[PDB]
Each structure stands twice: as C-alpha cells, then as structure tokens.
Amino acid sequence: QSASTLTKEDVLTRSVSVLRGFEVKTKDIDLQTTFVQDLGMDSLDLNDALVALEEEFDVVFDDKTANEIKTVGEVVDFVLANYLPTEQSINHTIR
Amino acid sequence: MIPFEALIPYAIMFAGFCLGGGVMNSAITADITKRARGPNQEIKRNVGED
Amino acid sequence: VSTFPLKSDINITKSGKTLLSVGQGGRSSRTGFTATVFGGTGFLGRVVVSKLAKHGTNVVVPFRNDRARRQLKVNGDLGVVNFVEFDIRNLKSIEDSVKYSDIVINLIGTEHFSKNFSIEDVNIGAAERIAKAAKEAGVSRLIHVSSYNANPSSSSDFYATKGIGEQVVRDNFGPDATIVRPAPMYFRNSPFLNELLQIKALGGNVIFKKEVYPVHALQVGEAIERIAFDDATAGQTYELFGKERYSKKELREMIKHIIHIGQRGYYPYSAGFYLPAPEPFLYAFALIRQYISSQPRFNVDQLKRSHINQEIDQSAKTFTDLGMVPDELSEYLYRYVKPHISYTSQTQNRTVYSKEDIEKLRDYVNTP
Amino acid sequence: ATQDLPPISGYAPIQWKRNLPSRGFRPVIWFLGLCTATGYGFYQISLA
Amino acid sequence: MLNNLFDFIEYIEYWLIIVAFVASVLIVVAYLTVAERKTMGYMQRRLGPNAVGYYGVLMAVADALKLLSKEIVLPHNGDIIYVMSGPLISLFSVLLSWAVIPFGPGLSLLDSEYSIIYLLASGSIGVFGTVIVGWMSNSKYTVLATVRTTAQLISYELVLTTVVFIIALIVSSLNINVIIESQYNIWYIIPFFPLCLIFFISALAETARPPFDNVEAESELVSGHMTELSASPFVIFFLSEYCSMVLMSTLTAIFFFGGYLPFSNTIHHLILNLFDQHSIYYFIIEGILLSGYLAIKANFFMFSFVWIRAAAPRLRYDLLILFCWYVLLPIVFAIVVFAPGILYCFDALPVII
Amino acid sequence: YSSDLPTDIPVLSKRPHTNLLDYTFTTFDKMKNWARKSSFWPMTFGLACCAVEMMHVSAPRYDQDRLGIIFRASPRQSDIMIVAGTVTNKMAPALRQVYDQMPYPRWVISMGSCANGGGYYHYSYSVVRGVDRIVPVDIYVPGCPPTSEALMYGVFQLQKKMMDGQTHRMWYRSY
Amino acid sequence: EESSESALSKATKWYLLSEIFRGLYITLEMYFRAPYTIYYPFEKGPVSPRFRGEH
Amino acid sequence: MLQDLFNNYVILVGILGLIFLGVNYFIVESPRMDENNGNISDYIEKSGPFECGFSSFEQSHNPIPIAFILV
Amino acid sequence: SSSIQRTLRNLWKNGFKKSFKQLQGYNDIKSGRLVGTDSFGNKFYEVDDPVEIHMRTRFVEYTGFWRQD
Amino acid sequence: TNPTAFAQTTRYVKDSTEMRTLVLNLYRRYLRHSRGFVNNYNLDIPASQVRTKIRQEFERQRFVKDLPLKNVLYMKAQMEFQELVNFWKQQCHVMQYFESIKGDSFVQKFLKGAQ
Ligand SMILES: NC(=O)C1=CN([C@@H]2O[C@H](COP(=O)(O)OP(=O)(O)OC[C@H]3O[C@@H](n4cnc5c(N)ncnc54)[C@H](OP(=O)(O)O)[C@@H]3O)[C@@H](O)[C@H]2O)C=CC1
Ligand SMILES: CCCCCCCCCCCC(=O)OC[C@H](COP(=O)(O)OCC[N+](C)(C)C)OC(=O)CCCCCCCCCCC
Ligand SMILES: CCCCCCCCCCCC(=O)OC[C@H](COP(=O)(O)OCC[N+](C)(C)C)OC(=O)CCCCCCCCCCC
Ligand SMILES: CCCCCCCCCCCC(=O)OC[C@H](COP(=O)(O)OCC[N+](C)(C)C)OC(=O)CCCCCCCCCCC
Ligand code: SF4
Q1: Which ligand is closest in space to the CA of residue E197?
Q2: What is the DSSP track for E186-221?
Q3: Residues of G numbered 6-45 whose beta carbons fall under 8 angstroms of chain E's beta carbons: which are they?
Q4: Chain J contact for H59, CB < 8 A?
Q5: Active-site annotation of A, residues
Q6: Are C261 and C267 in contact (CB under 8 A)?
Q7: Which ligand has the nearest atom to the CA of F118?
Q8: What is the rounded CA–CA span in Å between residue C87 and residue H18?
Q9: How far is the CA of I28 from the centre of ligand 2 (A)?
Q10: Is the Cβ of B14 closer than 8 Å to some Cβ of chain E?
Q11: By the 8 A CB rule, do D27 and G8 touch?
C-alpha cells in the first residue's frame, strides 16, 4: 500500500515535461543535461524549476541538495530515493 | 423590604399553572359526566326536571 | 477612480459657472461639482455615488428607503454626501434635489409595475419630470440611463418605455441631454448574475435562452464619471456592452461547474437546478404572482424579453469614444460567483478560474 | 475655615479588618438532623 | 345553528384543552425569563426589566417578537435544514416531556405505567438536538461547545437516571401520578434529602445552567453552539432551554414535595367546602388549588435556578466529570442498595394499589 | 403609454393616514418598532476607556436591563453595534467584518471622540479618524468619555428614531 | 493526622455544601434591600460646578 | 388507558415548531425594504463563520482530540 | 423604597390621572412637592418621603405622554 | 516561552557567500507556500501569478551590495514570510498587495495641476 511505484524512465519522462514548460535554451533534456550550462538557468530560474519539480512528484528538496544539484539526473535520483505516498485516512486502507 | 415588582412575574407564572389546572380539571370531568347520562344527545345535553 | 478624475483643475459648466478643484484627488479633496444621483440607493446607484463622492464631488441623493441610504455616506467626507427624502409623485421634493446641482444623473427605472406605479410612470413619467425640473433649475448636464434594447416600437413594455423615455427626456431637458444604454451588468449582488446563481430557477429552458453582451458594472459607473465631467459627451448616446456575446444557458452551465454543484451527480437534478416548464404555465404563474406575491417576481414582460436578444445600435457610441477598453466577463466571472461556492473553505485546494480557465470552461459546456 | 480640613478632634475610627463570623450549628448537629430526617422518613414510608 | 354548534364544540373540545395546556406551559416559560432577570436584578441591587409593558409584564413579548422579526443567517436559503434541525429536535423533546406531567389526579395528557421511562427517554433526545448544530461546522466556537455538551451528558445522565429510579423503586412504580399520590403521608424530601440535592445538581447540569454553564459560557465560548444562530433558530433553542428549566423545577416538586398535594390538608378541605360539588365551579377551583400547590413548589425551584446563578461561579466541565463519577455515582449507588435493605428489614416492600 | 404622475403627493414621513390599510400597516410597523426598541440588544464591543462608561450603564445605578437592554457576545444575536473606543488601522478590518456579520435590521452607535473623529489621537499614524469611514453611523455620542447618562440619552434618541420607522407602510405607499 | 476538625465534621460540611448555602443566604439578603437604580431621564445623577460638558 | 388525547398533543407539538419558523419567514421585511444588500446567499461577509473579528485557518474537518474519550 | 406600601401612598396622593401618566413613562409611581415649572412646560418635584434613596429626591414630569426627552 | 511557528532566531551573517544561500533558501520557501497563500487568503489569482509576484519583489534587491543592508533585508523578509504563513495578515491586506495597479506628458500634468 504505502510504497513507491516510480520508475527511472517515468520520473525522467515527467522531469523533461516540466522543464519544457520554461524558457530553457534546449528542448533536448536527458540525465546529463545541466541546469546552469545546457538549460541556461540563473539563480532564480533554477530555483523556480526545482520548486516546479517538487510540485510534480510531491517531494521537497532539502537545502543542501538544492544548493548543490547540477544535472537533471541528480534530480531523478533524488526523487526515486525519497518519494513516498502520502498517508491516507483510516478509511482508505481498511474498508 | 419586599420588592413587589419582582414578584409580579411569579404571580403570572402562578396563574399559568392555574390556567392549565382549572381548564383540565373541569372540562375533562364535565365531558365524562355528560357522556355518562345516556346513549343519545337529547339526554346528554338536556337536563330533566325530575 | 485613479488618483484624480478630472482632466483639468478648472472646469466651466454649460451654464457658465467656473468650478475649481482643490486637493490631489482624495477624500479630503474637492472637485467643485455638485451632482444629484436619482435612484442612488439602487444597484448601479451605489457604484455611481461611490465614484463621485470618493473624489470630493458633492452628491445629492434623493431617496425613499431610509435604511438603504445609510451606507452611501461612507463614500465621502463630512458634508460631501447629502440626502433628500423624495418621491416621484412629489414635485417639490424633486425640485429641491436639483436646486444646487451642476449634474443630474437619472438612474430611476424599473422592469416591473406595482400597485402604486406602472412601467410608464417610472420609465417615462419619472424621467420626464426629472428632466424638466433639471432644466428649470439651470442644471448644466443631465445623464439618463435607458436600457440596452431601447426601442419605442418594441413589443416589450420595458424596451418600449425605455425607448420613449429617451425621446421625452431630450424634448424636456433639451439637446444637451446624454443618454446611456448599458448592457446587463455583472458585479457583486448583480441582478443579471443573481438570476443565474439561483438554484431553483423555474422555467430555465424558456428564460435562459436570451443572448446578451454583458458589461462590467464598475466600468458603467466609470463611464458615467467620464461622461459627467466631459462636456464633449453632451447630446450623445452611448451603448455600453462587452465584446463577447453570451447566452444565459452558457453562463448558467459555466456557473454550475464553478459552484461545484456537480460534485454529486444526482444533486443538481434533485435540488431543482433544472425546472423545465411549458411557457403557457410560466405565463400563468407570472400573471398570478403579479397580484398575489408582495415581492417583485418574474413577471409577464420579462417572459416576453426572453425571446428578444440584445441588438446593438451601430450609430451610437461606445467605450472607444470615451477612451476605455471594455472588461471581459471571463476575467471577472470567478470573483463575482466566488461567494456562492458550496464548500471551498481551503479544504484541499481552491480552484481559481483565470481568464484562460473560464474560456476553456465555455468550450466544455458547449461540448456535447 | 478657608479650606477643606478634618475636624479638630478628627474622624471616628472605621471598620476595615475582615468581619466574616461563622454561623450555624456544629457539623455533627447537621449530620444528626440528616439521620433523624432519614429515619423518620423511612418510618412513614414503611407505614404507607 | 344552535344544535349544530352545541355538538361542534363537543367535537373540538379536547383540542381546546390541549391548546389551553400548551398556553399554560408557554406562559410560565415566557415569564420565567422575566422573573429570572427581575430576581437577579434585586439580588444584584438593580431593578430588572420594568420599562417594557406595565412594570415589565411585556418584556417576554418584546424579546420574542423582535427576534421573530430578524433576518435568518445561513449560507443559503436551502440550508434551512442545518440551522433548524438542531433547535427543532431540542424543542420537540422538551414539549413532549410535558405530556406526562399531571397537574392533578389523572390530569395528564399521557397516562401510562411507564411514564418515568418516557420522561427520561424524551429528555435524552434533546441532547441530540444540541450536538446537531456542530455539524462539521466552520465555526470553532460552535465545535468546542459540542464537545463540552457531550461531556456534560456523560456526567448527569447516569446520576439523574439513578436518582429517579430510587424514587420509583421506593414506590415500586414507574407512573408519575402514582409517585405523587404515594407522598400523601410523607414528602420524599425528608427521607431522601441527599437525593433532592443530587437531583437538583443533575437538573442544573442537564439544562446547562450555572454553575454548570460550560456549554454557553460567554467568557469562554462567546455563545457556545448558539454563536451562529439568529432569529427563529435562536428563539427555539432559547425556548427549549427555558422549557427544560420549568420542567426540571416541576419534576423536583413532584419527586420530593408531593407534586400537587396540598401543603395543609385542613386548609384544602375548608376552601373546597365553600363550593358545591354538584356544580362545575367546584372543579374549576379544585384545579386551581391542585395546580396552585404545584405552581408554588415549582416556582420555588425556578427561583432556586435563578438563585444559584446569582450566587455561585461557573465550574469547569472537566471538574464536573470528576464530580459526578467520583462523588455522585458512588453515593446514589449506595442509596439504591440501602433503601431495599431498610424496606425488606421492616417488611415494607412496596406494591402498587 | 401615457403616464400622469400627481405633483403634490406628500412624502412618506409627511403622508397622513387616509384609508383603512394605512392604519393596518402603521399598526404593523409600531408592533415591530416597539419590539425592537424594547428589545435593544447591543454587542459587547468595548475597545478603550469609552467602554468603562458603557459598563456603568449596566451598573445598578442605571441598570440598562430595566429598559430591555442586554449585551450579546455574538453579532448574530445583536442588532446594535456600539463603537466604544479608538478604532486603529490594525483593528479596522476586524470591525468591518464584525459589523457585516450582524443580521438586519442593524444600527451603529459611535461613542466618544475616538469613534466620532479620532479625538486625542486624530493626528496619529495608526488611528482611524472616525468609525464612519468604515461603517455607517446612526447616532454620535459626544464626550471623552460620554457620561453614562450621555450614552443613555443617545440610545433614547436612537429608540425615538426606531419608533418612527415605516418599513411596512413604505411598501404600501412608496413601492 | 494533624487536622483540627474530625473527618465526620469535615465530611458534613463537604457533603452538605456548608459554604455554598452561606453564599446563597448572603445573596438573598440583598433581595430584601433597597436597590441603587435611578430613573433616568426622569431623575439625574449628581453633578458638580466643575463638570465639563458642552462648550 | 386511552391515548387519543396524547396523539393530538404530539401532532400539535410538531405543527407548533413549524409555526415559529413560518412566522419568522413571513414577518421579516424583504431585503429591498431593508438596506437592500441582496440575498444572504450572496452576502458572504455575513454568512461566513464568526472568529471574533479576524479570519483564521479553516479547520472544519480537522480531527479534534478528546481528553475524556475513556470516560 | 421597593415596597408596595410606598406605591399605594403615591397612588393615593397623585390620583388616577397623575399616576397613570407615570405608569406610562416613569415605570414608577412617585409623589412630591411641586417646586416649579420651566418655559417648555415641564414640572419639577422634590420628594419628602423618608424611604426614598439618596439620588431619587428630585424628578421631572414631562409634558408628553408617550415620549420623553 | 516557546517561539511561534516558522520563527527564526535573528542572526547577523558576516559572510557574503553564506548570505546568498540563506536568501535562496528563503526564496524557495516562498514558492512552496504560494498555493497556501492562495488558499488561506482566497485570492482571485492563480498560484502562478503569486510566484511571479514573489520573483519580482526578490529581483528588486538583486543588486544590493552592502552586507549590513542584506542582513536587514533578509531579516524583514523572514518576518514577512512568517506573517503570511501563520495567517496573521487579514485577507484585505493581501488583496491590496496584489492590487498594485506610460506616464503623462508635461502638458497633461500641467493642465490638471501636476504635483
Ligand atoms: N443589468 C441591469 O441592472 C441593467 C440596468 N438598466 C437600468 O439602469 C438603471 C439602474 O438600475 P440598477 O441599479 O442597474 O438596478 P435597479 O432596478 O434596482 O435600480 C432602480 C433604481 O431606480 C429607483 N426606482 C425605481 N422605481 C422608483 C420609483 N417609483 N421611485 C423612486 N425610485 C425608483 C430605485 O430606487 P429604490 O431602490 O429606493 O427603490 C433604484 O434606485 C435602471 O434604470 C435600469 O432600468 C437597464 C439594462 C441593464
Ligand atoms: C399579537 C402579537 C403579540 C402581541 C404584541 C403586542 C405588542 C405591544 C404593542 C406595541 C405598543 C406600542 O407600540 O404602543 C406605543 C404607541 C405610541 O407610539 P409612539 O411612536 O411612541 O407615539 C406615536 C403615537 N401618537 C402619535 C398617537 C403619539 O402607543 C399608542 O399609540 C397607543 C394608542 C393606540 C390605541 C391603543 C388602544 C387600542 C386597543 C389596543 C389593544 C387591542
Ligand atoms: C434544613 C434544610 C435547608 C438547609 C440545608 C443546608 C443547611 C446547611 C448544611 C450544612 C451546615 C454545616 O455543615 O454546618 C456548619 C457550617 C459552618 O459552621 P462551622 O464552620 O462548623 O462553625 C464553627 C463552629 N461554631 C458552630 C461553634 C461556630 O454552618 C453553616 O455554614 C450554616 C449555614 C447557614 C446559612 C444558610 C442556611 C439557609 C440556607 C438557604 C435556604 C435553603
Ligand atoms: C451521604 C450524603 C449524600 C449527600 C448528597 C449531596 C452531595 C453533594 C456533593 C458533595 C460533594 C461536593 O460538593 O464536592 C465538591 C466537588 C469536588 O471537589 P474536589 O475536587 O473533591 O475538592 C474538594 C475535596 N477536598 C476538600 C478534600 C479537596 O466540586 C464542587 O465544588 C461541586 C460544586 C457543586 C455545587 C452545586 C450546588 C447547587 C445548589 C444546591 C443547593 C440547592
Ligand atoms: S473618546 Fe476619550 S474616553 Fe473614549 S476611548 Fe477615546 S480617549 Fe477614551
């Protein structure tokens, strides 16, 4: 019940879709695509993308991770390791 | 010093119970007595001389 | 509104008076103008009184309901908003309202007739008496608000009396009378939106088929502010309407999705959100309530108007002549139907409908 | 005389200490009255 | 006419009796609000209402009529269910409880051997009316009152029910009129003085009256469950709460002070000897006397309801929970064993006659 | 469509009673006006020192309850709003919300110099210069603070105004 | 073990609400006393020559 | 034991409760006779919850811990 | 001061018409010695009854019957 | 005494590099609570417009160089963040915050009075 159902390909696929809703330089986004160089994101543009990625996967990047993340692949790895389903009420599970 | 103005609402409440008791005790008793006189309305209503 | 409504600090009225404005245009500022707003306690009247009094213009508000006039005084500073107890059947009361006024705005009009007044008396008789009294008082400017489908040859009592009202006002006051033809106005507690927001709308198949060009009420009051203080608008006719045409059925269904009445599939039909009735029955019910109900209900004339769509007089002027861009209903629809949302209450997430969201919702409504 | 002053002898003393004397019978008497009322009440109940 | 009218009245006579009965209760409840303000005023050295009707006799009418001419506040007009379901259930519960209150011998609308059970059962329904107002409500003060209301019910319900059962056990009957007649020789205040105090305390808790006014504490929960109520819903809840005060005051007079039985038997005979029993005037006076005896005893406890309000501060509801379970319940359960032991010892087990 | 409006029909406040229905609706108004005047329920809205004088109206010396005056803690159960104290900018939104939560009919009383025009704090950066900038005021009570009799006189003036209401006769003659 | 009053004496006051009935009796005493209310506007409160009112 | 009289009283009590609501609905003046602020269903500033003046978080359906649940 | 005997004494001294007017505005039946009248027409009295409290020894009788100012 | 929710201890940062991280950390907190701001205050705009507004206000102080000014600016931003998240502001204030709105020529100001 309360377990992750994510896959590396699905997380990467949805990560690309979110990042293509911004004014990024290139629409060709993969694991090795860097935010600063390939996507041309500054301080505030990068944080806008990170929060937007937080909304998609319902995860919250910590301060250390968000201040040191460089590539999209690191975002994908963080989502896979830390994502959990939100706890439901008592009625949703046992009924 | 007895304040009579404070006792006015209690007197009206006292009359409130008496209104229910006076009507219920008399109207119900009269209805039972009237219907025990006979099987027809000419005996229940009209009272004979004898 | 802005910060200073007048285009200049010195204005010369049509009657020759020179009026000087003082202050930057706040509550303590003055414009030198005194205006009378007939029917200032109505829906549009409160908007007009608020805009005039907020910049210092003296407002004289004739009234018949004593409790309804109280909230008008908050708009202006001390001595700005004045009240006169009046009746359209009392000539002296009307003459006192316009004695000191440079501008007279006639917002008096009705769609129903009652035991004391007919449709002719209010739409024609009241307008004529106000217009003639204004001229004898030497009022520089008169502004009359007719309806959107004003036509003296119309088969509807409301549209015909409004059409005659335009002509009788110009004859009495003179060629210097400006006439405004506003479309149905949407706003907080707007009569145009109140009917759509009513859950138990009897005969929605016959009534909600009318197509209109709804216009923002705040802009109509803003337009009147432009017209009153601009002598270049004298003698003209203004049709105030939105760009996008809407049918009441489209608005009714679009609102239904915003209110989230459809969260339960059975509820809209069970609650009576659809009340299909034959028109002959609606005519009978409207005829009966015209003499039984003490409150103005859906009457016979409004039943006729459901078959008449809003037609725009091309010769008349628009917001472009006044230098304004009409507001779009899609932008302001959510904020005026928000109070009627069922639960909301920030439970999980408020569904805020933007300009693009409303337009998409219109496509969903018409999608079978 | 030409001002507001207290009398020559001064004002009489006032009461400002706590004055809440106890009242009523001893608690044992009230307990006996409760038992006496209960005893007599059950006696009349028993007779009825 | 005449003949067709003299039997039409007979056909509708018993509806007039009920309407008169309803008016009799309403008058007492209406003027209890005036009496409470007058009684507290003089105790607080004020006057109380004296400027609404001659000496304040129209104060109740003005308060009711003004509220009946007030706007009803609700999210939508169709939401008339939500703010009216609560008060209506509370009002119906207390009005139906008056059916088994005999103003005289056999002068009750409902006569049954289970009148005691009907009385307690009907009163418990009124609690459900109070909790209805807090129906997933958005008002935080309404919600807090519902939690307190349930807590108070757990306090008094066990204590109040068991005290009434002891009186019923002493008479071996659950009929209210039989309980009244059983007190001809002794009023149950004397043998069961502790129970009368306990009953009155439970009555205060049941009606949410001070010192147990935690449901409607103005200094704690502004107005409690009535903070969102206005116009008719407020009146119905206000009417129901004061109808319970009269009902509980009348119940105290019935269970412990002989109900309608005369204060003095000699005085009762002398007054009735002035009237002929062959005329209806005797039974009009008799109903006035018997209900007058009940009214005097009931007015004293309605005075006592006001008296305790003007003399005691409010007690916290969590302290009330410990008060009933640790003190009241052991005492009442002790008496429910003590009483049969006394009766069996002296061969005085009760029977119904 | 011919309209013939009479010219010399007196306004409602001057219009005498002519037919039978005039006395009927005037009786309807007076029964309601008497009830609301007698059941004068203000709301407990004490802000500053003006509230202390408002408490002394409920004191035994004046005993506002003798006139039918009861203070209610909820806006739903109150029809009179007495602004007794200073209205600050931080407080103004709260005052407007509480006023809007009172069901109609409702009246507002402005007591003291603070509520009337700001009084001692008129030239303050955080004080509203008169509660009438936020809510409509029916009667202004002067004083700093107005005495307990000054407030009672203002209430009497409002009750005099309430007894002159013609809500139901207005529907018959003016609508 | 150092209480001055016996357990029965302390229980009699506690069970029979000794101080509560004392408080009730004091409140009833005021019920038979003259109130303080004056009938404004037919009667007026005290005033002094130093009083400040309308200018 | 006859209970026809009791049944009539219960019928009257149910009807009596509706009279209080019906009287209040037919006695109050219409909004247009008052300040004419419209229907209560639109006056959201009035139909909203009471929070002593300041709006707070909406916790209508939040859990409420009860310290006397065992009692 | 709140005794019924005081009301009966004032009822007898004033009479029916005077007391009924007090029963309409004054909410109290009071009697006193006339002190004088003002230009508006109001009458002013002083009470010699020993049972009257401190602040209630002077009162006015307004001209109007239904409203007082 | 326990501090209120979302309360930070005031501190004077003596490193410019550290100050940049704190601003970035606070910048993300504003973006994450944008939907909460819309829900709590019942705004008429979507959360996307709120985030645009937050970015615009942050960009107004992007080129501030003096470190002592940064500490005051950061401290006041933390106080503003705490005020919004805890629903201490009334809904009217937030509505007016987003209700913020080619200048007039010389003659246009001249004809009306100017300043
Ligand atoms: N969607 C819309 O509302 C549209 C408006 N109009 C017209 O614009 C004008 C403004 O009306 P609006 O504010 O929108 O809504 P309303 O119909 O509620 O306004 C009517 C105004 O005229 C007054 N009035 C009506 N009859 C009388 C009368 N016998 N004596 C005195 N006053 C009277 C009313 O005063 P009181 O309130 O005191 O009774 C009220 O102030 C009206 O003339 C209307 O016909 C036309 C097309 C669209
Ligand atoms: C049936 C529902 C429940 C009962 C509700 C009863 C509510 C109480 C009544 C309100 C009182 C009120 O308002 O009377 C106050 C008013 C005064 O009015 P004012 O504004 O002060 O002066 C204005 C009036 N002038 C101009 C005349 C001064 O007195 C009256 O005019 C009373 C005179 C009318 C005739 C009275 C006798 C006729 C018989 C009446 C009884 C059948
Ligand atoms: C008869 C039925 C009605 C009354 C029932 C209740 C009476 C009190 C029961 C406990 C008494 C107790 O415990 O008594 C003890 C206490 C206190 O005395 P202490 O501290 O020991 O004094 C110290 C030792 N001395 C005695 C040597 C000085 O006395 C009281 O406070 C008595 C209260 C009297 C005023 C209230 C009486 C009227 C009540 C109101 C009308 C119903
Ligand atoms: C066998 C004879 C049975 C007697 C039957 C009657 C028993 C009554 C209750 C006694 C115990 C008690 O009142 O207890 C007090 C309790 C709990 O107090 P506690 O937390 O234990 O602290 C006290 C113990 N100390 C000192 C050891 C720490 O709270 C209260 O203050 C409850 C107040 C209720 C007041 C209601 C009065 C209403 C008016 C009544 C008069 C008409
Ligand atoms: S007006 Fe004077 S007394 Fe009243 S609140 Fe202001 S400072 Fe205090």
Answers
A1: 4
A2: --TTTTTHHHHHHHHHHHHHHTT-TTS--TT-HHHH
A3: 15, 17, 20, 23-24, 26-28, 30-31, 33, 35-37
A4: no
A5: 42
A6: yes
A7: 5
A8: 40
A9: 20
A10: yes
A11: yes
